[PDB]
UniProtKB/Swiss-Prot annotation:
Protein name according to UniProt: Pentalenene synthase
Gene name of this polypeptide: penA
Lineage: Bacteria, Bacillati, Actinomycetota, Actinomycetes, Kitasatosporales
Species name: Streptomyces exfoliatus
Effect of H268A: 3-fold decrease in activity
Catalytic activity of the protein: (2E,6E)-farnesyl diphosphate = pentalenene + diphosphate
InterPro entries named in the record: Isoprenoid_synthase_dom_sf, PentlnSyn, Terpene_cyclase-like_2
Length: 268
């Protein structure tokens, strides 16, 4: 991974305060669960996904990593074995994208809603709508994988890389030009980011894509990622980006796409 390792300078404070949010939302209710949460290294992971964020912006990234693993743990048992029960929970979480949740919603849903509320604020409506679709793809992917009980079609959505990348924009208080986000070149870059994350995850998860060749695919995809990066100057002219748009595209390349590729590696 020819990308620099980066970590937010506010990582220590973010890690020290990481428990206050999931406790106030009822996601962590016992001292033992708090310690199990601390052992995951989730604030550390967030500080590497979002080295450009500090303070509340980084706290939102910490909470997303916190929520990710608290959420995924709810499907480790029987619920993850049938799609109907998986969907019953995911629909309650995903409903937060469409409006306020009933007070009766499970705590994991109110926690997501508090993340999503903070994610959207200050971003363009079109960015919000696109990020909301990425979430729905993520929740729909959990139902697809439960219905299963080249696996990339399901895993590319359940790995949660795109909402991670989305949050890097919000945490950096910038948006990549929407027409460049939809570009075939950026789409290929994001697909590499997703594929590298799920490959590195299945390797560290031997306790699955294993069914040597995976390490070469990570290397081939990262070499292609560099080629795709070299096309970005011409992509910017094709879409007639102005100066601020070229800078936002550059921030997206370095603080969102590169970070999500490198950060998971350094965290593992």
């Amino acid at each position: 991974i020819p990308l620099p390792g980066r970590q937010s300078p506010d990582h220590a404070r973010a890690e020290a305060e990481q428990l206050a949010w999931p406790r106030s939302l009822g996601l962590i209710r016992s001292d033992a669960a708090a310690e199990r949460h601390l052992r995951g290294g989730y604030a550390d992971l967030a500080s590497r996904f979002y080295p450009h964020a500090t303070g509340a912006d980084l706290d939102l990234g910490v909470d997303l990593m916190s929520w990710y693993f608290l959420f995924d743990d709810l499907f480790d048992g029987p619920r993850g074995e049938n799609p109907e029960d998986t969907k019953q929970l995911t629909d309650q979480v995903a409903a937060a994208l469409d409006g306020p949740l009933p007070d009766t919603a499970p705590p994991i849903a109110h926690g997501f809603a508090d993340i999503w509320r903070r994610t959207c604020e200050g971003m363009t409506p079109a960015w919000c709508a696109r990020s909301a679709r990425h979430w729905r793809n993520y929740f729909d992917g959990y139902v697809d994988e439960a219905e299963s009980r080249q696996y990339l079609a399901m895993r590319r959505h359940t790995i949660g890389v795109q909402p991670t990348v989305d949050l890097a924009e919000r945490a950096g208080r910038f948006e990549v030009p929407h027409r460049v986000f939809d570009s075939a070149v950026m789409s290929a870059m994001l697909q590499i980011a997703v594929d590298v994350n799920l490959l590195l995850n299945d390797i560290a998860s031997l306790e699955n894509m294993v069914m040597s060749h995976m390490q070469n695919e990570v290397r081939a995809r990262l070499e292609q990622y560099l080629l795709l990066e070299s096309c970005l100057p011409k992509v910017g002219e094709i879409y007639q980006l102005d100066t601020a748009e070229r800078e936002a595209l550059e921030r997206y390349r370095t603080d969102a796409v590169r970070t999500v590729i490198r950060g998971s590696y350094d965290w593992h």
